[PDB]
Symmetry: C2
Subunit: 144 residues, 2 copies
């Protein structure tokens, strides 16, 4: 279930640590942010899976939402427990970025809702359509 | 000269825009910073080439230094002209990160030494030893 078809690859990037907060709100990470800073990705990339893993300092619930101040998730909402690794594979359906750029993952904590590192995320893993071999642009070494 | 041997690949990442500055100093980007946030890279990676490209708002000089408040570069120092793309391929010698982590690229501008975007960098391109196919860790989907 970490194996891919031959026309897809895994890409990843490091997740930021969460700072303490002063407002009362939902914690949400938008999909466009998850993808920012991954060079294999462009307007033609199709997206098949997003894997997330985390540990939280409280019980709570989480899931993916489509509206985006994002609502708590309804369909597919799942629970987690304090200090227990939780993970989730989200199916992205072979869609392009412009079709997923309204999505976010949202967490609702029972307690310690404003603490620093209240959720600690592993790297994000995304299965995408396999890119051509990476190469600098042809005009990179002009005036070298 | 953008082609690699079969046991190397290109990796890249986006460069940050430069803010205006209030101090009088050299502009330097350390090698450890260039490499931060590239998942294919670890303690065993060997480094073969670093490609940089930039446009500056003034004439000046630049080059790679080994001491690192880094000195202006001596050996291999090169000139550039205002509003003219310049690029450079630096040979990294097949070395590991711990052998390159004292290196930086340093720019010395003739004029406008404190302006925002005084140097605008293209993505950094690095030729490294070819990694195994990227895969999430085996324990990623515990408690899914």
């Amino acid at each position: 279930s970490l194996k891919l078809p031959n026309n897809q690859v895994w890409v990843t990037r490091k997740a930021s640590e969460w700072s303490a907060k002063t407002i009362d709100t939902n914690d949400a990470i938008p999909f466009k942010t998850i993808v920012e800073g991954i060079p294999e990705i462009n307007s033609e990339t199709k997206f098949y899976r997003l894997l997330i893993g985390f540990v939280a300092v409280s019980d709570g619930t989480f899931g993916m939402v489509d509206g985006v101040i994002p609502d708590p998730p309804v369909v597919g909402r799942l629970g987690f427990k304090k200090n227990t690794y939780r993970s989730r594979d989200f199916d992205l359906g072979g869609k392009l970025l412009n079709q997923l750029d309204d999505r976010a993952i949202v967490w609702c904590l029972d307690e310690r809702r404003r603490d620093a590192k209240r959720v600690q995320l592993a790297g994000y893993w995304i299965a995408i359509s396999k890119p051509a071999p990476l190469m600098p642009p042809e005009d990179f070494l002009v005036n070298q």
